[PDB]
Design brief:
part of a larger assembly; 8 chains; A mainly beta (about 100); B alpha+beta (about 190); C mainly beta (about 160); D alpha+beta (about 230); E alpha+beta (about 190); F alpha+beta (about 170); G mainly alpha (about 25); H mainly alpha (about 200); B: about 190 residues; alpha+beta; Outer Surface Protein A, domain 3; 2 domains; four-stranded antiparallel beta sheet; three-stranded antiparallel beta sheet; 2 helices; about 15% helix; about 40% strand; E: about 190 residues; two-stranded parallel sheet; 6 helices; 3 strands; RNA-binding; rRNA processing (chain C); nucleus (chain C)
Chain lengths: ~100, ~190, ~160, ~230, ~190, ~170, ~25, ~200
RNA sequence: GCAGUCAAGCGUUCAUAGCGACAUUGCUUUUUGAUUCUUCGAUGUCGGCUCUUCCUAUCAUACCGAAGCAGAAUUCGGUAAGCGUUGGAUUGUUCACCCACUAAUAGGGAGUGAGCUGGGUUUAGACCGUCGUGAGACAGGUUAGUUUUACCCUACUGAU
RNA sequence: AAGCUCGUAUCAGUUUUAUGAGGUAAAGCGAAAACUUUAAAUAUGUAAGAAGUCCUUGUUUGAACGUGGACAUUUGAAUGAAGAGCUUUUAGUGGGCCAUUUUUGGUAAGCAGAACUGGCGAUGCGGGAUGAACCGAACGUAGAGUUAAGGUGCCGGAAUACACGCUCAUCAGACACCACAAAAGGUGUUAGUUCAUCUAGACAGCCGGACGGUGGCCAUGGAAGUCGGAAUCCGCUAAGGAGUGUGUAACAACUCACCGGCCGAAUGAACUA
């Protein structure tokens, strides 16, 4: 007997297993594609989530319905003191 | 039945020198040089003469002898492209929106850029294949000329323009617009 | 037709340009057993009684039929399987015509079915041939004649009979 | 024959292949004419319109003109002495050089030779010959004659001819309100041009019969004198 | 499994029912002369060849089959042959007066139907009347009608109960005509409850 | 198996009403004497109603090629009964001996027309005396003047599982 | 398509005499 | 049930699509009678209606018979019988559908003449040479070249005069024959003249 | 379906002894879309709540091909299961059908028989109807009516 | 079988002989293919001796035989074997599917009845990957050899053996087959059969002719071979339809079918596997 009324799946099967993360600091599993023509830059940073607050933004979005109108937005404040370099790691590209 | 030996003859003209080692054919003549990799066909060449070359298949089936005439004709098209040269002429026609076909250097490469096809705001970019020359005839309005030593490249790039301006979701009995190959010929005309 | 083109029962003037052993045709047919004729109907709250019987084949039921009371009704003849007409094919004249059923003369399986008037393959039925315009010598016109049912109406829907001329 | 072969396309038409017996009939008619008539000319009519041939054939009745396969006529007259039909006749089958006709006759040789010297009718400028003129198709709406009668005297070319004008004739044609139209004058050929196929197909398309036709007559066989005189009126 | 055979008998190729010509005139004349009294009921019908007897009279004949003379392909299409109207009027002026009458009739029809509608104008305001309630379909249920047909099939006398308040409203004529056709031998009686 | 060609000569058993009956001979291709003699009896059954029990074998003799080292064009005539009827066939077999030609034809019938040795009837085998009389192109292709062909892509059979050189398909 | 058709044809046509030459004394 | 419903749906589409020829304005009625035979038109749509009723009846009968089927074989035969009966119903309808496709293609192309709006017909011989009254007084394309009938149907154009909408109709042309010998092409012109309240 | 027809072929020895594809013809409710707005014994209890997956025989969305396809829309067909496929009204239930919304409201498998539940298998109460001399049983109809893991193994979800 | 009664040579799931048999339909040669020869089984009934035969000299033309004697042990075909019927008496057992071969009747198809014979029951073992119904196989404990059926790339003991062909499958096949879906469909490949054409030039290509009465008759706005209905003939021919299709409002033009020129040698069609 087929399913009588079709309904979509509850949840996402690509976020499995829903286990505890192995570390508190989440890994970066992909970094932006390296372009050797540009100067040397850092592809990420580390900070601490401080909290949230409210922003009024003067929205300049042409073609929108809120164009040239103030819009109240929620934002997240991440406390980011400077991080200090302490090492280098070199990665070779191997068939494994 | 397996034919004991079937042969075809590739006649080389006076100004052309062809070099064939391990079924890689280089053809050189007045208009430049062409090369083709024939290593997927099990076929045997032979210089019977400075003006004739014999291409042959020993103990071949019905599908294998079907590839001799293809190989001979491909080498022949090479020779005609390197002496006479191939010249495809395309004519673009329109009803209300005039097609604007220009040649632009996008990123170090060469492009045919078709604009305003039936009023499309989309810009259609057709890359120019290497060795194909895109020229705009002034004597006739709205005609493109493609020329090159390789019939394959010229014909493919011409067909690329033919298809980049395909009319979608319209009655093609009433919407006659597009870029059409009018004439396939040789650059010379007459020798 | 093309090459045969290149190679090169009288009627009156009002009928030109108009046209469109005593053995029975089925002397022996497949035998239908009583358990295939009749479908057992259970009654009661527990389906515990099984005397009522339901005919699974087509029947001709007559012209003044009424259903006897359900308490005294054993042989069930459902109203859907009751056939009133059968399209009869005349062998000589080559035409088939939708003729009413008048009676069931002989069901080959058993006389019980003839009494019940079931229409199966090979049953001899009497049909109202008054449309066909058959006249016997002596001037009487034939309006009733026999026909053998040549198909299995249970699995065809219709009753197809051929006329016994 | 093994598979993947071209399917022979047949249609349902009336007329049938002639076969061997028609060639036998031509052979025997040539033989009997050789026995009957005296003078037998060989006529070259390589590209001849049928009304011209029928007028030539009816500009005399007491003679006979026989065509057919060149090989069957050379056979009937005979390839060589070992297989010929009349004394010194193989010098004629050596002189059958294309579309050849045989003119059996009793008319005096002077009459026939002057007639075939002086007979002429116009034809289309068939390809592979020197062009007898030069016509440039005018710019604008092309008419049926391409300007050889004036525009008000001619009718516009059928719109249905434009695909042929554009593909088989390579003329850069447009359709402007249902009329074939070239934006610039187009020359087809020049006087003295060795015509290609498409030039002569264009000229025939406009009904340009500027060229002329006459019978190219080579030697004739005199039956009773049993010799052949190499007349040659090209 | 029985041995279902049918013997070769002469009885099966003979006539079974013949009707005399004189009996045909008799019954054909008697059919018209019969009258039905409401208190007479049919106990049992004579088995008669009604196909030879129920020949009514007729003042108009069936319209002719036109597809025999001109086909659909001849009427219209790429191979159409119908070039002239097959019933062209005698002259122009009778055509004109016929056209005037047709236009007058059509426009009067539009006017009279304009008295029935403003539902067309409701389409200008785009609403639709409510759904038919399922409670006004009750009684048309197929199980109820199956039950009735069992009751009719099993009854010799059928009482049709009528509400004396509005009998014609509570009269089910379709069942009456079905019984008059299909079961003439079952006796309808009205009871004015 | 590997064929031999026999003549098998027989006759009906003599009678008071007939001394010395007719002697009948067939040329028969078979692996050995016993199969060939049974083959004779089967054909003699079919040709005319002679029973094996009513007759005898007056001789059986192996027939060898007159010149078993001269390549001939053979024209072989065959009827058979596979797979849905009966047929005539004619096969050219360029070969040295009649028995080798016959074995080649039996292999061809097994390969193409899927017919067993009992389904095949050899009707006549003839050395084509004149090369102009050969009719099949697959045999007529080896008769041409100054015939040469290579054997391209030689595959070398290796008695060793491993090799220390990439093999060559030369000459 | 047998090449020696005419030869075997003539040979077996010569062998049609025996079926009628000998049977009667 | 499903096959019967499918056939009935196609037939209902056909029947509810095509115009009711006796309910349209008399001008359109006479135009459609001229172009298509009115009797053929109605007969074909009636054959469609008859096929619809018969297919409904076959579906009902064989649903009732399947209700008493005792085996997969008998029920399969009953389904095949019902489906074949619908098939022979439809195949007997070959000619009306062939007629109706051509009618639908043609009737969907016909102009949009409004009998009641301000119209003016262009009779006689307006289209001569390059000139044509309908090409010049309104936007519309009408073929012109001097032969007797260069247009075989009514052509409509439109223009505005004093801020009002007008339609102009080019009639295919008339010959001076009697009414019993005029063809459909000029019955179009005559019906257009006789019906449309015009100048 | 029955009864014909024709004959590509088959049999073959005789193509008339017979078979026989395709094609076709008669039968089915009245040729002018009116009716034919029209119902007629399923001895069947399965069905909804939650939830997952698969099938493609695709309803939608993607891309194509063919149509008098002007445009707009539509019809028919191809690849295609990636992704969706509703809210209610109804009656033993379910489909149907109805109303509407929707891009569409596709069709199915494994389904969820003591995961949870409604009617029915619903057992001892009772009432009416039919039959039976009766005790009673049924052509019926109506009503009320306890049902209880896992703490074992495995699976699965998370955790050492 | 506690048994004993003769074991005296008594038989046989077989053949042969002799005679039936369905006398089938076929011999050729009949006065005529229609019987009368004649011939194999379809694949099974009877008989083949020593308690049998001969002679006798008596009973009712008559042969049924009373009675006494001889035949002698190749004692009456082959092959195999050591064994009696019972007189006596006792345990289990009466349930059941499958296949073959006949035979009768069947219909959507399965099949249903009869008769016999095998398999299983009670039975392992080798093989079919697996297993009631298949193939093989005379079950004590072992050793050696050889095999059956099935196999020999690797799993896996055993030739990635030799040889002749065929096949390429965008879900091959490895598989049973007078089994079904199964009759067909395919510009896949291979081998064949029949017929036809061909140096009087074949197939494929270009090129040319493709005509004249004639725009045949009728129809109608037009209809000229080509919207249609009926004719469908003649002439001139090498050939050319009162026209194969594209086309035109009608014509024009192009086209094929049909000839012919160039080229040069094999090709086409239908069928079968």
């Amino acid at each position: 007997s087929h399913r009588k009324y079709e309904a979509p799946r509850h949840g996402h099967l690509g976020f499995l297993p829903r286990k505890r993360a192995a570390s508190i600091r989440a890994r970066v599993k992909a970094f932006p594609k390296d372009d050797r023509s540009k100067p040397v830059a850092l592809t990420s940073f580390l900070g601490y989530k401080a909290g949230m607050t409210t922003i009024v933004r003067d929205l300049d979005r042409p073609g929108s319905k809120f164009h040239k109108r103030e819009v109240v937005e929620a934002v997240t404040v991440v406390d980011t003191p400077p991080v200090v370099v302490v090492g280098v790691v070199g990665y070779v590209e191997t068939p494994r | 039945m397996k034919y004991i030996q079937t042969e075809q003859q590739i006649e080389v003209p006076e100004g052309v020198t062809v070099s064939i080692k391990s079924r890689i054919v280089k053809v050189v003549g007045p208009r430049g040089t062409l090369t083709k990799n024939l290593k997927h066909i099990d076929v045997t060449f032979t210089k019977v003469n400075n003006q004739l070359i014999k291409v042959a298949v020993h103990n071949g089936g019905r599908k294998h002898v079907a590839a001799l005439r293809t190989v001979k004709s491909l080498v022949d098209n090479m020779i005609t492209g390197v002496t006479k040269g191939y010249k495809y002429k395309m004519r673009y026609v329109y009803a209300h929106f005039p097609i604007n076909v220009n040649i632009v250097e996008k990123d170090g490469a060469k492009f045919i850029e078709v604009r305003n096809f039936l009023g499309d705001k989309k810009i259609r970019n057709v890359p120019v294949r290497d060795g194909v020359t895109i020229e705009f005839s002034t004597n006739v309005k709205d005609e493109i000329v493609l020329s090159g030593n390789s019939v394959e490249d010229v014909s493919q790039n011409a067909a690329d323009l033919q298809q980049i301006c395909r009319v979608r979701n319209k009655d093609i009995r009433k919407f006659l617009d597009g870029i059409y190959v009018s004439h396939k010929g040789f650059i010379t005309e007459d020798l | 037709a093309h090459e045969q083109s290149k190679v090169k029962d009288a009627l009156p003037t009002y009928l030109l340009d108009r046209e469109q052993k005593f053995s029975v045709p089925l002397p022996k047919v497949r035998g239908i057993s009583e358990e295939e004729m009749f479908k057992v109907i259970k009654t009661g709250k527990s389906r515990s009684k099984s005397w009522k019987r339901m005919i699974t084949k087509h029947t001709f039921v007559g012209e003044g039929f009424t259903r006897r009371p359900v308490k005294m009704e054993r042989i069930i003849r459902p109203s859907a399987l009751r056939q009133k007409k059968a399209n009869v094919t005349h062998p000589e004249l080559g035409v088939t015509v939708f003729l009413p059923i008048l009676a069931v003369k002989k069901n080959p399986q058993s006389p019980m079915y003839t009494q019940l008037g079931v229409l199966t393959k090979g049953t001899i039925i009497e049909v109202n041939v008054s449309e066909l315009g058959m006249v016997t010598a002596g001037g009487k016109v034939v309006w009733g004649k026999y026909a053998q049912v040549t198909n299995e109406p249970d699995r065809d829907g219709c009753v197809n009979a051929v006329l016994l001329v | 024959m093994p598979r993947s072969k071209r399917s022979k396309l047949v249609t349902l038409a009336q007329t049938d292949k002639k076969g061997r017996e028609n060639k036998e009939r031509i052979f025997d008619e040539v033989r009997e004419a050789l026995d009957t008539y005296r003078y037998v000319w060989v006529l070259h009519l390589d590209d001849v319109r049928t009304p011209v041939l029928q007028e030539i054939r009816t500009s005399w009745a007491g003679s006979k003109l026989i065509m057919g396969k060149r090989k069957v006529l050379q056979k009937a007259l005979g390839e060589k002495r070992e297989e010929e039909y009349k004394e010194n006749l193989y010098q004629l089958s050596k002189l059958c050089s294309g579309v050849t006709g045989l003119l059996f006759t009793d008319e005096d040789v002077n009459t026939v030779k002057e007639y075939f010297k002086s007979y002429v009718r116009s034809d289309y400028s068939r390809p592979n010959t020197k062009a007898p003129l030069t016509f440039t198709i005018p710019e604008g709406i092309v008419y049926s004659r391409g300007g050889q009668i004036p525009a008000e005297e001619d009718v516009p070319m059928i719109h249905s001819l434009e695909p042929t004008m554009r593909n088989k004739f390579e003329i850069p044609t447009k359709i402007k309100a249902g009329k074939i139209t070239i934006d610039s004058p187009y020359l087809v050929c020049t006087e003295g041009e060795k015509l290609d196929v498409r030039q002569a197909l264009i000229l025939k398309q406009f009904g340009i019969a500027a060229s002329e036709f006459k019978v190219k007559v080579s030697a004739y066989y005199d039956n009773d004198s049993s010799t052949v005189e190499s007349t040659n009126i090209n | 499994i029985p041995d279902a055979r049918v013997q070769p008998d002469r009885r099966w190729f003979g006539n079974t029912r013949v009707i005399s010509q004189d009996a045909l005139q008799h019954f054909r004349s008697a059919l018209g002369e019969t009258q039905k009294d409401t208190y007479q009921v049919l106990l049992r019908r004579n088995k008669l060849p009604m196909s030879l007897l129920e020949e009514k009279d007729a003042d108009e004949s069936p319209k002719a089959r036109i597809l025999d003379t001109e086909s659909y392909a001849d009427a219209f299409g790429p191979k159409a042959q119908r070039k002239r109207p097959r019933l062209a009027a005698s002259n122009l002026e009778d055509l004109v007066k016929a056209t005037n009458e047709d236009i007058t009739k059509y426009e009067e029809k539009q006017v009279l139907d304009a008295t029935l509608g403003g539902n067309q104008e409701d389409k200008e305001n785009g609403w639709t009347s409510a759904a038919k309630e399922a409670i006004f379909s009750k009684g048309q249920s197929k199980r109820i009608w199956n039950e009735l047909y069992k009751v009719i099939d099993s009854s010799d006398v059928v009482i049709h109960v009528l509400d004396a308040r509005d009998p014609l409203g509570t009269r089910c004529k379709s069942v009456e005509e079905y019984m008059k056709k299909e079961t003439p031998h079952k006796h309808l009686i009205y009871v004015l409850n | 198996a590997h064929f031999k060609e026999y003549q098998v000569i027989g006759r009906r058993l003599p009678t008071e009403s007939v001394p010395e009956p007719k002697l009948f001979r067939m040329r028969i291709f078979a692996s050995n004497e016993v199969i060939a003699k049974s083959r004779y009896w089967y054909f003699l059954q079919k040709l005319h109603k002679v029973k094996k029990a009513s007759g005898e074998i007056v001789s059986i003799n192996q027939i060898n090629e007159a010149h078993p080292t001269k390549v001939k064009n053979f024209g072989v005539w065959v009827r058979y009964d596979s797979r849905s009827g009966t047929h005539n066939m004619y096969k050219e077999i360029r070969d040295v001996s009649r028995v080798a030609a016959v074995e080649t034809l039996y292999q061809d019938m097994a390969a193409r027309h899927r017919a067993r040795f009992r389904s095949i009837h050899i009707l006549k085998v003839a050395e084509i005396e004149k090369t102009a009389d050969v009719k099949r192109q697959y045999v007529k292709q080896f008769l041409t003047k100054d015939l040469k062909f290579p054997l391209p892509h030689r595959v070398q059979k290796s008695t060793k599982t491993f090799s220390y050189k990439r093999p060559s398909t030369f000459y | 398509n047998f090449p020696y058709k005419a030869k075997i044809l003539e040979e077996i046509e010569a062998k049609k005499m025996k079926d009628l030459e000998e049977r009667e004394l | 049930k499903y096959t019967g419903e499918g056939f009935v749906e196609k037939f209902e589409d056909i029947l509810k699509g095509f115009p009711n020829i006796n309910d349209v304005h008399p001008f359109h009625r006479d135009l459609m009678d001229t172009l298509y035979e009115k009797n053929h038109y109605k007969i074909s749509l009636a054959a469609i209606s008859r096929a619809k009723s018969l297919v409904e009846q076959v579906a009902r009968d064989y649903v009732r018979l399947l209700k008493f089927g005792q085996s997969l074989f008998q029920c399969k035969q009953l389904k095949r019988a019902a489906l074949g009966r619908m098939a022979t119903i439809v195949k007997k309808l070959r000619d009306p559908l062939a007629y109706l496709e051509q009618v639908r293609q043609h009737i969907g192309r016909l102009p949009s003449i409004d009998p009641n709006t301000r119209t003016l017909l262009i009779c006689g011989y307006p289209n001569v040479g390059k000139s044509s009254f309908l090409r010049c007084i309104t936007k519309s394309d009408v073929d012109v070249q001097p032969y007797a009938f260069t247009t075989k149907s009514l052509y409509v154009g439109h223009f505005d005069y004093k801020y009002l909408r007008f339609q102009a109709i080019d009639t295919p042309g008339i010959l001076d024959r009697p009414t019993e010998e005029m063809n459909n092409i000029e019955m179009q012109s005559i019906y257009a003249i006789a019906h449309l309240r015009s100048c």
